[PDB]
């Protein structure tokens with residue numbers, strides 16, 4: 001793939017419908033882990049203990065402890081130059097009748113903190129709950145999310161004594177429910193929201209330029225979004241610190257930290 005930023009910016013000058021796909025690499029520089037990078041969440045912990053439906057049925061406290069920890073860390077984190085370049089791009093293009101849409105894998109909400117509006121959160125949100133009984137979805141920004149989690153840090157599955165009884169974990173505050181809440185996120189083996197997925201699909205059919213920023217292009221279906229668009233002849237530009245399973249499908253690859261590689265692309 002080309003690293004000709006001039007040639008890419010020519011495609012950028014002519015695009016009316018830009019699709020920007022993002023993963024944890026776009027948030028790294030804000031000072032939070034990725035999933036599979038060094039010090040990543042799935043390096044430190046085993047994903048099958050924390051991010052599957054079975055994980056949650058077998059040990060909802062361990063799982064909640066991990067999402068609680070992440071919520072408490074993320075509160076004070078700020079959008080980095082890559083988030084900010086994306087937001088300013090959307091606002092600038094939007095003012096001229098051109099569309100920029102963000103299709104994010106990240107649940108951290110940092111694209112909303114930056115001022116981005118057209119944001120599909122395809123794996124849910126760190127800050128939303130879903131009730132296991134009634135199905136109610138809610139923003140929840142209580143700190144701590146429940147009293148029993150107050151002052152809990154990152155969980156060790158071997159410290160059985162740190163586990164909280166299930167009745168003291170976050171419960172639905174809807175009058176007459178009290179069901180157990182789970183994070184409103186998409187785990188391995190769970191379908192993505194079909195409304196979201198459908199809308200994303202149409203965005204990808206309409207886009208005339210696609211960027212793929214800070215994702216390992218391992219996890220499906222997100223990993224095939226940009227490959228799909230490229231199979232229609234649309235230019236895709238990858239921004240990543242390394243090559244991925246998908247790089248050889250794309251017209252451009254811009255190597256480096258997105259904090260520095262992305263802002264001149266979007267200028």
Ligand SMILES: [Zn+2]
Nearest residue numbers: 131134172177
């Ligand atoms: Zn409920």
